[PDB]
Amino acid sequence: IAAEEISWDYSEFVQRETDIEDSDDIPEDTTYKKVVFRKYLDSTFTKRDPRGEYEEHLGILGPIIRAEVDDVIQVRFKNLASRPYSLHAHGLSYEKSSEGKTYEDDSPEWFKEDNAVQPNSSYTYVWHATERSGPESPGSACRAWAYYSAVNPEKDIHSGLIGPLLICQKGILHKDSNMPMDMREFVLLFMTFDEKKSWYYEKKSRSSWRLTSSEMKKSHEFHAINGMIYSLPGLKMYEQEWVRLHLLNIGGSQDIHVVHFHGQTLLENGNKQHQLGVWPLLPGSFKTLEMKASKPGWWLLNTEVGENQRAGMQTPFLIMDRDCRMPMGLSTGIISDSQIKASEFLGYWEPRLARLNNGGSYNAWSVEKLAAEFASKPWIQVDMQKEVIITGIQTQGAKHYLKSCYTTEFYVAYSSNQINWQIFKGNSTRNVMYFNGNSDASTIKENQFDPPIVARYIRISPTRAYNRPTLRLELQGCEVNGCSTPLGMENGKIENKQITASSFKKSWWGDYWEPFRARLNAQGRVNAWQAKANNNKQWLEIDLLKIKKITAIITQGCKSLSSEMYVKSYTIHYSEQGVEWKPYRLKSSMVDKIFEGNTNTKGHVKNFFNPPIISRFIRVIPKTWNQSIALRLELFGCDIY
Amino acid sequence: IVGGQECKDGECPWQALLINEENEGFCGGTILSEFYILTAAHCLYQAKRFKVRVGDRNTEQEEGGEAVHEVEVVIKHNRFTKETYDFDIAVLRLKTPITFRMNVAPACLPERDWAESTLMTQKTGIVSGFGRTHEKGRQSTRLKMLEVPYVDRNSCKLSSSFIITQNMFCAGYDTKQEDACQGDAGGPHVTRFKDTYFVTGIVSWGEGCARKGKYGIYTKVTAFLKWIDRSMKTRGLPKAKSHAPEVITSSPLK
Amino acid sequence: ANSFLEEMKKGHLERECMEETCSYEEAREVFEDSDKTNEFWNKYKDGDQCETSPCQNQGKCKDGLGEYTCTCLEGFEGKNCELFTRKLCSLDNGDCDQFCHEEQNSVVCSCARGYTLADNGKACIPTGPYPCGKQTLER
């Protein structure tokens, strides 16, 4: 553990993390002369612990130590500035050998030596892990503690010298560097930090110091939430998650809040007999309890106060979709990787032509020759110019006679501003400095991601393959609102009684067509709906039972194992509880929309629609066509409450 | 779940069955050496005579020349409460010395230091006994020794209406199944600490034995060091080699 | 490739070549051929990147891509020799199966009569058949 004096910025809302307004000029100084901690894997310097994706809740606070039973991590410290620092823990009945509080003792330079660290000099110090923090009774399994300095009970909690001691139980551990996880726990420290009430007070203020900052009352004592202001990242979960939330408050003794979630009932564990609903906080203890989500959307996270909301915390948490495993750019023909950027390519084969199992001995990704490939920088900037959320990317090689040709290892990066390349994706939750890769050629390999990574400038980079660097990375994203879920128009949950066909083709001296299989990827006779006539009169009605919010659509088309036909344009007829075969109104004016069907033969059509389609009996009438009527209709609705 | 499994015919010596001259037993004992057998005091007081035989795995049957450990006379105990139960430990004064055989294995003497390291680690234990504490309708002919866990002290004073002191504590399962009055009275609740075996429990009846699925009552001989020391050195060297070794002592166990 | 008798043959390439040293006669009898063994030997494999010394204290490595084990200095223990030597036992009985009692930055475990010691002191080696506390594992 370290403590280098680094000026941290409290008013962090100017960084535009999740803020809306732009006229937010700071009267005083944005940054404040404080001290931030740091985690080291060794006793000396020049080796820091990269803050992974899971190590998010910290802000001005440093790292979080995770020491359990039969597991101890050293905490060597060396002062860099000119003032002696201290470190004091809380919780167990630790003796003065690992306490570090400035009071009466017994040993000369051991019980209080850690409170006086000389500059440019290391010191041997290590804490002890106990079994007291383990929550008894069948229910919980984690209960965090706190630790800070000890040279002053008040001038240290405002100097950025804080730290929570998250301690769980023993029995359930994961393979994430031998750290017990197997969940998705969160920890938040709500405590204001003052510059005038600290050891590093520069005798004056950044503007005025007459009547406690003439600009704003206690402007140096901003209500910094989690080290920042108007931030609170990482609040991107899914539907129905019983994740554990750790609420810690040690300094805020005269600030009582009551946490109330907008439409999320509470459930207390342990006794398994309480419901509560709301749960306040008391100063001193470390309250922890589950969340249990319900409905998706940007639900606001507030504490029902007037001084710590509009001037404290006001970050709504988002719930994205859980079953958002729909095709993004592989099965469709609209969304593609045409906006791909890179620098070094891998051979002579075609760049975009990288589909799974394609004809020809040239199917990979390259523009320029590879010559020699090693640990250089063959970065592939996979930019989308929009928000992204990836939980799994597949990987497949190539072959044409016997060779394997597969990538064994490749590091991933990301960025959110293009001007800087935050090459830190390789050190996520489970990963530390490596990543999975392909194994063979005829076996599909996938790389599932654990943390909900969000960015905009995705960057991948290979290393070396079986004497032929060839990669074919697919694309698998997810929704943003969390409700656009497939109702089963292609899976099987929506029966034929809802989505009905028009006419049924039947030959005289032969067989008969079955155009009621209007789903995605169908076998047998036909693959979708093909009416007998060929004009602008046939229909394809769908029964949605209840009202839905449709935003995304898709459409492929069927054939007859000879010629391929499709539909070029159609019209969507919206209705309500009753019956009304009226086309969908155009929100940009007052007329009706003119939708377009399948463009080519098998390339799907992907389009977004902001105005909802509140209806139940949606009707589709194909206007134009190609050869014959054919389309694999499938939409994406929501559950409007 | 490990149920009521019988004792092995190898590492289960601590079973000095205390019977009578006729075909009628009463309780059992604990094998540690050749001069003292730890057992309950009500085994002899307010009962009948005393007949001990070590290495006797069965009462109705006999496994050959192995059960021989007769007792001359016996005394009582100072802290032994006649009405209730407290420090219910009595020493059986054998009359004939017995060497160390297969079914007769000695054990090291306990000490006061094994009181803060044996109760916090070994949260379980075994109760060796033929089954004479609850001699109602479970009289098994085979030597049974089930496994019982250890519970916190704050749940032992309410297991029985009698207020229990520090000498006796919980040593059974929760209020689920029958885990009390297991084995013979004076049965050794030896807990395999670490490379050794130290007994630390004596099963006795409090208000008898009925619907006692709550917790059990077992003593702690770590605090009983001052009694096993005052009755071993003050008696002097063995005169006639375990006569009495030595039953000629006062009633309050010196 | 795509054969039960060929998966066991190719499995010796990522073991008797990457972990230890390679050889020409290694893949000759295993593959039962001669056409693929010659092609695999022509491509050399430098093992490993120990010329730049990735570890401190001027430590060396071995013929192994990725994993390695160096002889770090004394006084420092752990993966990359970080944790110092153990001072007191106190808790967990000092990883020894007997009494733990510190003597001012000096801990030594030893059994009494009926038991002996081992080569380092991890556990007392049993000597007597049945002293005062053993377990019969004959059945």
mmCIF file of N, CA, C and O in Angstrom, chain A residues 42-43 74 124 128, chain C residues 1 82-84 91:
data_model
loop_
_atom_site.group_PDB
_atom_site.id
_atom_site.type_symbol
_atom_site.label_atom_id
_atom_site.label_comp_id
_atom_site.label_asym_id
_atom_site.label_seq_id
_atom_site.Cartn_x
_atom_site.Cartn_y
_atom_site.Cartn_z
ATOM 1 N N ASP A 42 4.682 -5.742 -5.202
ATOM 2 C CA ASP A 42 5.984 -5.988 -4.605
ATOM 3 C C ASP A 42 6.234 -4.973 -3.497
ATOM 4 O O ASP A 42 5.410 -4.095 -3.229
ATOM 5 N N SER A 43 7.393 -5.104 -2.848
ATOM 6 C CA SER A 43 7.727 -4.202 -1.751
ATOM 7 C C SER A 43 8.237 -2.859 -2.258
ATOM 8 O O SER A 43 8.023 -1.832 -1.604
ATOM 9 N N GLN A 74 0.580 -8.871 2.064
ATOM 10 C CA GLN A 74 1.422 -7.873 2.704
ATOM 11 C C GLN A 74 0.998 -6.464 2.292
ATOM 12 O O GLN A 74 0.391 -6.248 1.240
ATOM 13 N N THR A 124 8.254 -2.557 7.505
ATOM 14 C CA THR A 124 7.611 -3.866 7.526
ATOM 15 C C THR A 124 6.324 -3.787 8.338
ATOM 16 O O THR A 124 6.357 -3.507 9.541
ATOM 17 N N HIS A 128 -3.737 -8.625 10.145
ATOM 18 C CA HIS A 128 -4.160 -9.986 10.443
ATOM 19 C C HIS A 128 -5.625 -10.174 10.066
ATOM 20 O O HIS A 128 -6.460 -9.309 10.346
ATOM 21 N N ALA C 1 -5.261 -35.998 -37.138
ATOM 22 C CA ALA C 1 -6.404 -35.130 -37.395
ATOM 23 C C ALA C 1 -7.670 -35.948 -37.628
ATOM 24 O O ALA C 1 -7.732 -36.758 -38.556
ATOM 25 N N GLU C 82 8.622 -12.181 -2.191
ATOM 26 C CA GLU C 82 8.147 -10.913 -1.646
ATOM 27 C C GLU C 82 7.946 -10.980 -0.138
ATOM 28 O O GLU C 82 8.463 -10.121 0.584
ATOM 29 N N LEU C 83 7.213 -11.972 0.361
ATOM 30 C CA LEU C 83 6.968 -12.075 1.791
ATOM 31 C C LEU C 83 8.237 -12.500 2.522
ATOM 32 O O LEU C 83 9.007 -13.331 2.035
ATOM 33 N N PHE C 84 8.451 -11.919 3.700
ATOM 34 C CA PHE C 84 9.625 -12.224 4.506
ATOM 35 C C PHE C 84 9.413 -13.550 5.236
ATOM 36 O O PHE C 84 8.393 -14.225 5.072
ATOM 37 N N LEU C 91 -1.092 -18.295 15.619
ATOM 38 C CA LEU C 91 -2.279 -18.821 14.964
ATOM 39 C C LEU C 91 -1.925 -19.993 14.057
ATOM 40 O O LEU C 91 -0.781 -20.145 13.619
#
